[PDB]
Structure formats: structure tokens, C-alpha cells
UniProtKB/Swiss-Prot annotation, chains A, B, C, D, E, F:
GO BP term, example: cellulose catabolic process
Binding residue positions for substrate: 91
Gene3D superfamilies documented for this protein: alpha/beta hydrolase
Enzyme class: hydrolase
Statement: the UniProt record of this protein carries the keyword Secreted: no
EC code(s) of this entry: 3.1.1.41, 3.1.1.72
Keyword Cytoplasm listed: yes
Record's protein name: Cephalosporin-C deacetylase
Lineage: Bacteria, Bacillati, Bacillota, Bacilli, Bacillales
Predominant cellular place of this UniProt entry's protein: cytoplasm
Length: 317, 317, 317, 317, 317, 317
């Protein structure tokens, strides 16, 4: 409800040292190679939706681990090719896939795919639980980079871009990526791991500066990590777990992004604390802007919606 | 903190109609057949533990879906065969597997294995997430009995009994099952699905009378189901989910338990509401006793521990 | 979080006696006469908005008590006349007037004005505070129907319809009204007080069955009334206040609605309790449907948005 | 419940720069001139009250904007003239005007008037809502000094002194002002804006050091300002709003007070944070004392009541 | 915040069977005999207090168990004899003995003593803790009527009346008793155990219908009893504790009150639930009135203070 | 739930100046002399308990102020002498004396006595309430060292050691002391005041660095002191109360301990804040180790149980 993290003057210069291990780049190269071995085999199934001016589909494709990934895909009912958006959603926060949002993005003139996150909403997570974990997804497979939950998720997010760009009706040169919280971290991960996106808008991105997040966050879900360490108390487990996390920490991916990025942060956000978002932002080495909202937390920011629409119109239209 | 469910006189006669589908028995027969196809291949690894009078091991075996299930196994350091206990734990509630508790059970004279639940603590869950679920395990695979989370868990609980009974140092004719909440539901399930247990103690059992649970509970984790319906709103989804749950509802399993049962319930328990526990109890057709504690909720009840120790001494020693 | 009001079978037949005083109709006739004395003098000011396919304006008009009422007005950028919607907002719940929502309604093909409520957001409330009130608007002027806050608000809601219907680009025979909570009460009030609307959608309407609302609600803002009685304890004050409220209670207005109505209610809604909404619904004498959502409270219900879009497409297009 | 603001050693030297604009003095001169144009036309109406030794009245007078302002006025039943007190009340915190308190002040020998704040309790607020505001009074008319809620309130508080001093039975040379929270800020405002008061006692005064208050407060009602900025997000609105506030910030008025002042602060007060009260106190340039209570918050402090009674006896008797 | 106990029509006829044991009267006769053995030896020590019209003292006397009981005693500074009041305070709710309140009672014309409760504030509790109890006083000595905390407290309350009536300046034929919650229970107890009071006012009395209180209360301190049963689980302990409590339950004492009684209850009071207060009220057989306040809980009710002052003026002056 | 106190690097060097008054040592010498004047007169009463391998008793002895102190005493069913433990319990936190814990300690091979704290559980507190105090035991008799609650408690804890060591079956040279929170402070007090213990294990000890605890604690029960100062506001009372506390503050006793000490602290513990525990630890001048658990609060720490068992096995076996 109120200020809690570092003061803004300190946030502005907050830039922790990268925590990427020596084999970080090799890990991601190998991961993308694993993804490439699965044929996408995309399937569009039309959907009845109560609107004119748009055609709505259920898009399904195959991704890492042969997982079936799905979401709503909405297209302007006009001759293309169209600019496009892949939209990523918040942690445990998709209610029937946000169909109405995707439709509205299409009515704004974007062929839009709302990728649903494996295991959270509609999409399948074929990765196993190798060692047991705290309630939630944050510590699933955390003892090894190869088994960690977000490995499959990040690869799915790249694959979404490969699939949508392959469509005749989408202009592969004008694709944006967007989302908030988990959706914002997937936005930054996708732009770091794929050359497809032309521009990125990330609301208060999650999955950033893990070492600080678990010490400063006051709400879920970063605190699932804390919960995992309570239930698995070995000092060696904690060291391994933090190392695994560092391959997915968007502050370590951020220097790979080479397109324009617009980002938001609300200063009272206790879920994705300001410091962790400034850390990601400050590691970006690209055309970038951070919109800071003093009185907002982990939530829809109306002013930023205006910024987002103007940014995508500028870069994709 | 205070009374909230049906008054006692109503609880005493609360016996909802069974919700088991016509193919309930066949489903369990077929699930047991799938388990039987997997060779247990038990492995005992000695552990140095700071106590005399007991030998402590890490026990691992294979179960449904080729899952590696594990736990601490503690044995009186004296000539057997010994009476034995399989102990099941609460939802998301195992902290390094309760090694100290298992040791204490062995110092009480019982060869004791604390089965750790697949995906929650140490043990592997090889079952996939076929459709996306609310945060937690309660709705994992809920759209099909064959994929539902507790299918594997129940089978693992049966497999624990098969493994322990097979050891030379355990008297297979004097094995008890116990646990609280999730652990109490697994106790009833194991006693319903296996002829190995001689007697059972279930503290405030979970996984009971789901249709009422989701309408009366005031705390997690029954409300994960509610969360899943919020995120997946189709009426047909809800019907299917409840149908799936009815195969695992211990009130439907309860009439298969043929051994003595001691059960508890705290009348201010908002997690496993009294009415849900009375439903399970009232469907038992076996020697049974329910201990009702007016002033306790979802928590350790000292007086019931005395009852439990006395019950197992009576039946196993 | 959980069920709390009357069970469904009771809600279905919950129809309290109307509380309208004998001079209820005359009061409304006289209030409409006062409104009619004020020339609307509508003013449209174009806005640069970052979307194609729509024209966006700030619409201002004059209303009861010479109040300046305003909102965003968005129009499909194509040849009219267009179907139209007047959208009303929740209590204290407008953030810069929902400009993005109004634009989206226009991209769906509806010339749409989001009336901002006098004193809450942008619009002027010229009505005085004659006697002092509890924090909020609910008890402002409550000691006299003529001075009560929602007198002006209801008249402004009627005036919005008169203004929009008067535009050349709007088809006056295909205007809908919609809104949630306070916005849903205004929807019903506008449909009761004006023959202009063709159809109405009200999400969980507020301002209904006040005598029950203040005894069953568990959250703000019905409880402002309770707060006012705490601060102004005279028995005669309470009688007068409830009397005032009965002129504005939508259950008393409901039988004047002559167009099709779609309504929602979440069964765990502690703000606009189910019983209060069923009362309004059950007093409608018109083509109507109430969508009941077991697992939702006072919040956005995705499935109802689909229903709403389908309803307006059916009735307006 | 616990310490939260600056440590006491830092509080003691906390004295922010004044934020008064260049036309601050002219604004107040003009405001008082506006007040002077309204004839007070005071009216005393006797009241039945169950006590001997006091006569109780309802005092009504006209003030700025022709507003009817009222409150209970209690007088020692003995020949005067009497020393007198004007008592001001907390935000939204008067329950039927605190008649029993006023009577007790009269039994202590003071002709006492408890001014009730326009719009909050009994008294009329004739000032309009020019632009819409967040729930409450704190942001009503905040975009212009001339329309801002506290302009009328402060002028009413001065007018109360003019009215009571005009009574034959009150000794105009022995009038105190007192109150807590909002009542304390009105106390300081009245003593800064009027030469009538002889002495002032302010409990934990509100309306002080606004820039800090909205960043440090953890309870209502300072946080209404934050709420207003959430709903009206333009950077220019925020700058205007803070400027308007600065004409009413008692830290800017405080250097005008020329009578003895006694003030209290509780160190755990999260409504009127210690720092904001120290700011007001430290800007006083008069005979002054601040009583600091480590273990008290926003509440009645028994020890300070003793201090208050002794202070008024010293200065008014 | 909201209605929760039996509806009013049920409260009005709620009259549980008395729970007094067969030796209830003899216990009280014997307890009064024990009190009588202790010479009161009253001591008045003048206090300098900053008010005219009253003389203020610290009054100390000896009571049951040779306990030193004390409080503030304030007297109109004029020729007596005076009507008098003994005021009893709430549980753990005395802050330096309410000196200011006692003074105000004296300025209203009543020689007033605020008995401070042994062990809670200033006064000594010489009774031991014979068996260990839950945090608080409610279960201190609860295993035996002779050792129970409120035995001494009730006797001290009777002794206060004996002491005050013995002063030359108090008219022994015009003494009232008053207090709220714990203070209201002591008011009823004192009126039941002593013929000295002429009339009694009890705000929402505590210590009533214990069997229902511990099943319906939602706040401390009835729930201390529940806490004691959690910590001391023997069924025989609970039976004995409830038996002890029945000697002190004011519903069992109520039919001994022979003077006029005015009582209050707020219908949202979760501390002294309405049903518990109606039980005490309904067992009175004397001139009586219960004032019911729909919108108030366990708190100061301004309107009731007017009733109380009017009642004592009627009966004592 | 999250970090709140000084950062760990600062905790590690946190060592406040001792607050022991000049007569600290003399006070304790005199206190122990008072204890020695009471003959212990120990009594063992056998108990039925459902276990083999242990004999269980109720041990009662007489201590300071002729108080009857009791608890469960469990002995290995084998020929001794045995190593032994005296276990002390948490504030208001013993549920029927933790019989099952004591039995388990005996099954681990220790003759174990769980001393129950006078007035809290089973044991009698013969010390009176001399002046009235806040709800709870923390401020009982706080205005004088001689009457203060913990004087009797600490002496009881020493007497427990004298009694158990006197038993033929216990090896007086191999006695440990242990407990958590209040139990941990009694552990340190007992080892400072008695030469009997061979080794000590204290979980997150309470009763330490009082001046800081009341300023940093965010939960009960340190905050009872704050509550006492609210209800007894004299500056002199506060100075006296802090002085009394300093004779019992284990940071002042700690330098007297001459046996090995193992201690734990959880970094999110808001009951016994990290700083207060580091203060005690840092004043120890003996063989010592502090186990710091980042993710744990005021609760059972499984890893530390392993540390505790290994430490006692090392030092007592």
C-alpha cells in the first residue's frame, strides 16, 4: 500500500552483478537445439466469438518435450499481412486464456496469440517433478537447469514466435512481445532468445534478480523459493537451487535484447519489487524506457496502457 | 477459532449418498494392475543418525508410472520380526521427510517408513500436467481419472505397504497405517485398496466428500478446486472434475476398509471441515471410533496422540 | 471467499415487498421535470488516441443542478448511424474514465459513452451536503429525497441517453446500457426512467434492497449507511434515511424496465450480496436472464463478458 | 503497534523547508475577507440534557459560502463571564457531536463549543465537488485552492471563535482552542488565522507536511491523496494537487501562531506519523511544548489529558 | 462489523436454564463471611488534580484475602451528603485508573469511586495460581470456586460499596453502581450480593451464560476458557471448570438484584455476544430496561451515555 | 514472513552493554539462599503411558515461595544411572505438559523432566500480584525484583536440576538443559545459576536484551511490557520496570555460563527477534555455537533437531 523498497534515487542506479554461470550461453544454445528437434505442427481451430471485424482461433503447437501448447489467436478480419503480438500471462493468473483481451488486440489491428503457460492454463507441461517441490511451479525441477520448470516455458515462448511468424497472414518483420509480471519476464526472455520480435513491452517483469527478490518480496510467488528451502534444508540444496535460477534470471538474459523495450514498475509492488525490476531494466543495453508509477502496485496501470499502445503503433505499424 | 460447521447432533448422522460412478471398482482394479506391472526394486541406504537403539535408512522403490518414491525408514536395533507402521504426511507439509518422527516411531518399537508424496517432498511425480491446473496439486490431471494426481499417490501408498511387508525384519501380519489430513486420507485409501494393514489411525482425514468440502472449507487446499473452476469456467469442465474426484473420495473408498479404525476431528477445523470427516467415518463399515475434540482445529492434538499410541499397542504388539 | 448468503433455492424465490412510498412515481416525474429545465448543451472535444478505426472525444453536457457531466465517447471510424452503448462505472472505481475500455467498445462497433459519476471522477457534483454524512457518497443528502446524492446521478444517467441519442451518427433505436455494481444499478435506473434504451446488461447491480443490504453485506460501501447511523443515532434519523433510500432502490424501479435484461451475480460477492441482486431481478417484469456464477465475487467474470457481448450483438446489431 | 518512523533523535530536528507558495499570505487574507462578507447570524437553541450545573445549547452560525455550521455549546450554570474553549473534532470521527465531552468541559468551568465539520457531522458544506475526487473529503476541490475542502473548514473554525467571543457570557480574552488529529490541525490553523485564541492544545495534529505524510502514513486518511492520484494520473494533476495542499499545510501556517501551544504525539501513530507532527511543532515560533508518548498511537492519551487540563487552567483561569 | 448472533426475536425470549449448583447460595454466604472477617481500614490520600469544584483522593481499603484494593475517589467540593457511584472497569482496560472520568462523575454531582480490579490495575491480587492457567485471568483458579479469580473480585466490589457508604459525606441511601463489560458484570454481581445499591447501569455485561459464551464469542477474552481446555484436555477438567464458572455467572446471580436496572447491548458485539447479555437480562426479576443498539459493538455508545446519566439523575438525585 | 531485523553481518557483531545493576550478583545470591530454605520434598507418582521401554512419572517438588512445581518425568526402562535432561517450555505454550516429547527423550536414553512453569501449566505460582499488571505474566510484580514473576520461575528451574540430580538413577555429571523461547531463556538462566548442567541447548531464547526487544518485536509476548506502560504511564514506573527486568535479562546472566552451549535463531522470528538472540549469544564466554536459519521463524527447525541430538550425544553419552 506504501513505499517499501529502496528509494527511487537508489533504484535508478541499482545494477547487481550478473550471476550467469560460465556455461550460461551454452545452456541456452543447447536448449534451443532441443526445441528445434520438435516439429511445431501448428493447428488452428476456429472459435465462435460474439464480435464482428475479427476471426478467432484456438492455436495449438508442439514444443520442447513434445508438450502441447495452446492459446487464443485473434486476427483482424481484413486482408493481411498484419503486424502481430505474442502476449504472455501472469503467474497462475489466466482465466480461460483472456480471450476478450486477445480479441481487442486484434481489433486494434494485431494478429495476436496469447500463449498459455504449460501447466498453469490449458497448455500441457510434459516435464516431470524429478525431486519434489514446494506448492506451486517456482521450485519444480529447481535442482537442475535441465529439469527446471521455466526451461520449457521459455522455449515455448520462443516457439510461439516461430509459429506465428510462419503464418501467411502475419508480417514476420512486425511482431511485438508483451505481458506483465511472469508475462513481462517471458517478454524479456523471448526477446533475448529469439531474433523474431521487433519490439517489447514488459509490465513489472517477474523472474528477475532472484537473490534479492526472495529477501525483499512480501507476497507470493517469489516466496515459494523460501518455502522450498524450509522443506529442503541442506545448505547444498540452497546453493544448487540459486545456481539453477540464475540461468533463467532475466537480469542475466537482458543484455541479449537488441530491440526497443518499454517497461513499467509501480513503486508499491510487493510481488515484483521495484529493485528487481530496476535490475532487469539496468542490464538492458538497447533502446529502452522505464515508466515508473509511484502510486501503483502489481496491477493494471491505465497510463501505461496508453504508453503501450503508442509504442506498438510506433514500432509495428 | 470457533464452531462453524453443522452442530454435533447433525454431524453424527451426516452420511451423504456415495458418489462413486458405476465403473469405480473397475477403475481401481485396473489401477492396481498398472501398479503391479512395475517391479518395486526396493533399495535401502543406511544413514548415520545421532541416536542409539535404531537403524535408519533411506528407502527407495519404484511405483506407478515408474516413479521413484522414497522416505525415511527406521528400525528398532534388535532382533525382529518387528511390528511396522507406514506413515503418510500432510499436504505440502513435509520438511525433510520427518526423519526425527520416523526414528521416534522406531524407538517405540515399530519398523516405520514415512512415505514422501510424489512431487511434494523428495519423491518423483512422473505423471504429466495434461491440461493446466490451478496452483497446487489438487487439480493436476483432474479432467480424467487416469491422469489425476492422487491416482499415482494412492498407488504409491499401496506399494509402500507391499515393500515394507516384504522385508524379513517386518512382521507382515502386524502393520499399521497412519497419518493426518492428506496423510489421513492416504491411510483410509491404503486400507481400502490393500489387505496388508492390520489397523489404521487417521487424524482429521482429507480427500473426503468433495462436493461439500468445496462449499464449506474456509482455508486451503480444498479451495484449489474452486480456483480451478474460476480459471476454467465451462460447466462441462466442472461436471467432469467432480466426476474425477469421486473416484478418489475417501467416503466412496471407506466401505472397503475391513480393519479397526481410529479417527479424529477438531470441531473448529476449517481445512478438513468436521462434516467432511464425519462423512468418511459414517461410510466405514468396520470396527471404528471417532474422537471429537471441541477446541482443536487442523493441528496436533496431544490427547489423540495418546489414543493413537494406545491403539497401535493394542492391535500391533 | 465462500458461500455466505441464502442458499440458491431461497434466492430464486427471494422477492421482498416493494418499499416505494405512495409518492414514489410523482417524485420521479418531478425529478425528470427538473432535469428537463436544464439545456444539455453537449460539447465534443476530439482527443488524439493511439488507435486506428476509432474517433475519440471528451463529451460534456449539463444536467440536473446545472452540473457539468463528462466522459469519454468513442465512435467507429466509419459511416453511421451506429448502434450505441452508454456505460456506467462502479463506486469510486473509475481510473481516468476507462478511456481504453470505451475505445474497445467502439472497435466492437458501438458508439460508446462512459458517463463519469458526479463527484467520483471528472464530473462535477453541484448538489450540496445539507446535513453532514459518513465518509463517502452513500449518505450524502440522505435525509431528503430531493437532496440525496443519487437523485442527481440517476438524472445524469438519463441525460446521457438523451444526449447520445441526439447525435446524427447514433442510431437512437439501437442503444444499450451497461455497467457493473454501481454501474449496474445505474443501468437498471436508466432503463426504468427512460424509454431510450433497447436492452440492458447489469453486472451484479448495486443500490438494491437497502434494508437487507445493510444487514448482510460484509464489505463497503453499503456499510456507509451503517456508519452514518452510528454517527447520527436518532431513531427518527434512521427511519427517514431508509425512506429516502427507498426512492432510489432499484428493486422499486425494476418493474418499470420494459426491455430485455441480462444480469449477473457471483455467489460469494460480499459487496453486492446475492440476495440483494436476486431481489432486483425478481422484481423485473420483462424479458430477462440472470447468470449465476458460483465461484465468483465482486469482480470481473470472463464468462459473463461473453454473454454480454452476445446479448448486445443480438439486440443492437 | 510498534515504532516505524524516524528515530526520536532524528524527529527532534526534523524541520522541512516551507512549501508555501509566493501568494500564500494573500490567499489567506482574501479568504478571511470572503468570510467577513457573511453575517454570522448566530442562533442558540436550548437542549434538554441530563445534568445539573450546566446549560446546553445547539449553536448555529453562518460561515463561508453561506454554510450553516453547528455544534453543541455548553455553559457553566453560574454568572459569567466565563473562560471558553472551541473544540475541533477528528476526521469523520464525530458521533452525534460529542455532546457529553462538551458538557464535561463546561463542568470544568469553560463555555465550550464543539464545532462540527461541514459535510462530516451536522454542519452543511455548501462548497461543490468541482472535478470529482477520491472517496472522502481529502481531495474534494483539490485542483484549486479556492475550491478546496479545507478552505471552508478553516474559515468555519475562525468564525467559531468570532461567534463565541461575541457572547456576553464569554470572556473574549480567555478562549482556548483544542482538538485532536484533524481537530489538532484546525487548532493550529485557527490560532494562525485568528488573534482571538489565548492558548492552544493540539493532539497529534493532522494536515501537516503533506509531501512526507503521503509517503510515510500506513493508514487512512492521508492515503486518500494517493487514491486520488491513482484515479487521476496526469503528472500535472499531481503537481497542482500538492500545490493546493500547501496553502492548508499547518507546517506553513505554524510560524503565524503567537500564543502558547501544547502538543502531543504518540510514536506508534500511523495515521498522523510522528515526523509530520514534529514538522508542525518545529515550525512554531512561540511558547511551546511537545509531549511525546512512546507507547501510544492515534488515540486518547490519559497522561496528556492531565497536561491539557493543567495548561488551560494556567492560561485561561 | 455485522449481525452474527441470534436474530432479535430469538434474543428476546432467550432464557437458558440456570446452571447454579445446589450449594450456590451457601457458597456466596460463606464468601461474604470470609470478606467480613477482614477489617476494611479505608485510607484516603488527597491528590492535587487540575480542576476546581472537586476534591480528588486515592482510596485504599482491605478486602478478601487481605488484598489492598484501590482507586480514584472524587467528591463534589460542596456540602454533602452526596449521592454516590461506584464505577467498575473493563477487562484489562484500565489506564491509570480513569482518573479523569471519576472527576467528571464528581462534577456531575456524584461522590465517585472507580474500583481498580485486583491484579489488572493498581490493586493487589493476593489469591494464588493453584494449578496453572491460560494467559489471562479468566482461568486463574478455575478448578475450584474457592480459588477462582472472580471470587476475590466480586467480594472487592461489595467491599467498595460498604466503604463508600460508610463515609459521612456520602448519602448511603443514594448509591449507584455502573460499569461496562467486565464492569457491567461486576455491577450486576454487586447488586446481587449487596443491598447497598439503589440502582444499577450495566453496559453490555460480561461474565454471563458461560456455556454459550465460549461457543459464540469471536474475540477475547471468553476464549481464554477455550484456550485453557486446549492446554488442559481432560474431560473431567472441563466439567469442573464449567462448574466453577457457574458460581460466578451473572445469569445465576441476576434474580437476586432487587433494584432498577438499565442495560445495553450492541448487536454486532463479538466480545460480549448479544445472546449472553439477553440471558442476564432475561433472568432479572426487577424494574429493568435493555437498550439495544443495532449498529454498535463492544464500544462506547454515545446514546446510552445519555440514558445512563438520565437514569442516575432519576434514581439518585 | 520476511527479513526485518538488522542484517546478518550487523547481527554477528551486535553486543549491547550489560544492563546489570550494581547489586545484580547479590540479588541472585540472596535469591538462591531463599530457594535453599525450602526443602524440595520430591514426589514421583507413576503414570500409565502407552509405550514399552520407558517408565513415566509425574514429578512434584517444592520450590521458592513453597510453590508446588510439577511435570512429566520419563526414564529409560533399563538399569542406570542415566544421562538426563531438564526441558523447559515456551511462554503459555505447554499443552498438557508435552508428555509425548518427554517419553521420546527417554527413548533416546535420557532421564528427562519437563518442568512446567508456575502459573502457566500445572505448576502453582504462590507469588502474589502486588500492584496489578498487563494481561499475561511478563509484567507481574515488575515494579520490584523481589516480587517479579521470573524470580520464582528461574529458581524453580535451578531446583529442577537439584531434584533430578539427587535421583539414584540419574548421573548427576551428565545432565543437559534445553528448551525454546521462554524455554531457551530458562536454559541459559539455569546454566548461569547452577553448576549442575553439563551442556545446554537453547532454541531462539526469550528474556533477552529487553530494551531492544520491546522496540523491535512485532508479536507477543515482549509487547506485554509496552501494554503495561500504556496502562501505567508514569516515567518513574517505566524506569523501575526496566531496572527490574535487567536482573532477569539473560544477556546479563550469560557471562556466568561455563559449559558448552548450542543455540538457534531463525532470521524471520518476530517474537524473539534475531538481534535479541545474538545479544545473548555474544555475551556468552564459553564453548558455543549459534545455528542461524534464514527461512525459519519462531518454530520447530528440523535441521536444528539433528544438531541438538548430536550435541547431547557428544556431551552426555
Amino acid at each position: 500500500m506504501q513505499l517499501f523498497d529502496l528509494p527511487l534515487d537508489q533504484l535508478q542506479t541499482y545494477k547487481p552483478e550478473k550471476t550467469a554461470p560460465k556455461d550460461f550461453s551454452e545452456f541456452w544454445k543447447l536448449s534451443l537445439e532441443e526445441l528445434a528437434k520438435v516439429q511445431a505442427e501448428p493447428d488452428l481451430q476456429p472459435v465462435d466469438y460474439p464480435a464482428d471485424g475479427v476471426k478467432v482461433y484456438r492455436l495449438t503447437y508442439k514444443s520442447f518435450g513434445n508438450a502441447r501448447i495452446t492459446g487464443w489467436y485473434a486476427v483482424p478480419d481484413k486482408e493481411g499481412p498484419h503486424p502481430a503480438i505474442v502476449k504472455y500471462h501472469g503467474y497462475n493468473a489466466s482465466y480461460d486464456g483472456e480471450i476478450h483481451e486477445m480479441v481487442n488486440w486484434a481489433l486494434h489491428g494485431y494478429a495476436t496469440f496469447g500463449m498459455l503457460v504449460r501447466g498453469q492454463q490449458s497448455s500441457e507441461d510434459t516435464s516431470i517433478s524429478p525431486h519434489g517441490h514446494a506448492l506451486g511451479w517456482m521450485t519444480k525441477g529447481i535442482l537442475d537447469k535441465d529439469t527446471y520448470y521455466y526451461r520449457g516455458v521459455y522455449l515455448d515462448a520462443v516457439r510461439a514466435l516461430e509459429v506465428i511468424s510462419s503464418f501467411d497472414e502475419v508480417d514476420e518483420t512486425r511482431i511485438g512481445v508483451t505481458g506483465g509480471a511472469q508475462g513481462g519476464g517471458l517478454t524479456i526472455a523471448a526477446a533475448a532468445l529469439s531474433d523474431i520480435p521487433k519490439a517489447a513491452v514488459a509490465d513489472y517483469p517477474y523472474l528477475s534478480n532472484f537473490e534479492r527478490a526472495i529477501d525483499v518480496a512480501l507476497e507470493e510467488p517469489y516466496l515459494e523459493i523460501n518455502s522450498f528451502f524450509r522443506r529442503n534444508g541442506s545448505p547444498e540444496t540452497e546453493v544448487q537451487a540459486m545456481k539453477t535460477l540464475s540461468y533463467f534470471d532475466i537480469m542475466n538474459l537482458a543484455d541479449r535484447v537488441k530491440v526497443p523495450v518499454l517497461m513499467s514498475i509501480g513503486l508499491i509492488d510487493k510481488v515484483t519489487p521495484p529493485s528487481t525490476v530496476f535490475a532487469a531494466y539496468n542490464h538492458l543495453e538497447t533502446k529502452k524506457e522505464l515508466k515508473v508509477y509511484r502510486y501503483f502496485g502489481h496491477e493494471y496501470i491505465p497510463a501505461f496502457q496508453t504508453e503501450k499502445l503508442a509504442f506498438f503503433k510506433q514500432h509495428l505499424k
